[PDB]
Swiss-Prot record:
Similarity comment: Belongs to the limonene-1,2-epoxide hydrolase family.
Up-regulation conditions: By growth on monoterpenes.
Protein name in the entry: Limonene-1,2-epoxide hydrolase
Taxonomic source organism: Rhodococcus erythropolis (Arthrobacter picolinophilus)
Domain of life: Bacteria
Name of the gene encoding the protein in the UniProt record: limA
GO MF term list: limonene-1,2-epoxide hydrolase activity
Pathway as given in its UniProt record: Terpene metabolism; (4R)-limonene degradation; (1S,4R)-1-hydroxylimonen-2-one from (4R)-limonene: step 2/3
Length: 145
């Protein structure tokens, strides 16, 4: 999985330079855990998680459940973060997630730009934007949108 032509060293993951950037980098790196119980610890009680524009999860319980549901049908095999940056309390990750369907073994590269909001170092919001065309096939759960 190569570096894109448009990747900029000035915003590379290794150049993350605020507490929030470093926390978010750590979190998306921990996605390969496939471990909802570990991942949920990064979230505030008052929080949200959405794969745009699918129905959002609000509240830590809902986030935990949807993360747990994901890892029953999908392994996040790799996360490759090309850019990380932050502005006005928001953190951006321009990246690629590699998802492998557990029942088919088929692998999928998703180009993602995600925005995170943290409050006192805990995730208050997380919205990933990417193409969902292959998402319905890749995740063996009914899309609810």
């Amino acid at each position: 999985i190569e570096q894109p032509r448009w990747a900029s060293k000035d915003s590379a993951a290794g150049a993350a330079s605020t507490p929030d950037e470093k926390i978010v980098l750590e979190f998306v790196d921990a996605l390969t855990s496939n471990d909802a119980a570990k991942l949920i610890e990064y979230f505030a009680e008052d929080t949200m998680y959405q794969n745009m524009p699918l129905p959002p999860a609000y509240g830590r319980d809902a986030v935990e459940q949807t993360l747990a549901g994901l890892f029953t049908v999908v392994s996040v095999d790799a996360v490759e973060t090309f850019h990380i940056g932050s502005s006005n309390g928001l953190v951006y990750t321009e990246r690629v997630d590699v998802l492998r369907a557990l029942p088919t073994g088929k692998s999928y590269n998703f180009s993602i730009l995600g925005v995170f909001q943290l409050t006192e170092g805990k995730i208050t919001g997380w919205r990933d934007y990417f193409d969902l065309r292959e998402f319905e096939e890749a995740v063996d759960l009914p899309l609810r949108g």
